[PDB]
Amino acid sequence: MPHAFKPGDLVFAKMKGYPHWPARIDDIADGAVKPPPNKYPIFFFGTHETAFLGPKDLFPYDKSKDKYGKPNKRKGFNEGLWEIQNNPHASYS
């Protein structure tokens, strides 16, 4: 059975107006800005941008890659597919 999300979990994450995007739940580094309540810091592969999302926008990677894990025209998307499949826990800073 599922647990709550924790840092390191891999997902496709959904923002209004973008397709479901390869992403991970980030840690919050010592001293770094914290998210709001009930939200997680989402690092988006490819773009390397962060946003704060709640679980309704987070689709676990193993379950959803058959559907969402396909090439896309948007900037950073296909780079993001490589990262999530090949080195999802690297430093991309």
Residue position matching structure tokens 């770094």 = 32
Strand partners, 78: none
Q: State the Cα–Cα distance between residues 68 and 2, nearest whole angstrom.
A: 20
All residues at 6 or more sequence positions from 56 whose CB lies less than 8 Å from its CB, including other chains? none
For the chain, the three-class secondary structure string (H helix, E strand, C coil) is CCCCCCCCCEEEECCCCCCCEEEEECCCCCCCCCCCCCCEEEEECCCCCEEEECHHHEEEHHHHHHHHCCCCCCCCHHHHHHHHHHCCCCCCC
Indicate if the alpha-carbon torsion angle 5, 63, 43, 68 is positive or negative: negative
All residues at 6 or more sequence positions from 74 whose CB lies less than 8 Å from its CB, including other chains? 18, 19
- φ, ψ of residue 85 in degrees (nearest 5): -85, -35
Strand partners, 12: 22, 59
Domains in the chain and their CATH numbers?
A: 10-29+36-86 (2.30.30.140)
Amino acid, single-letter form, for residue 85: Q
Technique used to solve these coordinates:
X-ray
CA proximity to 77, closest of 10, 23, 41: 23
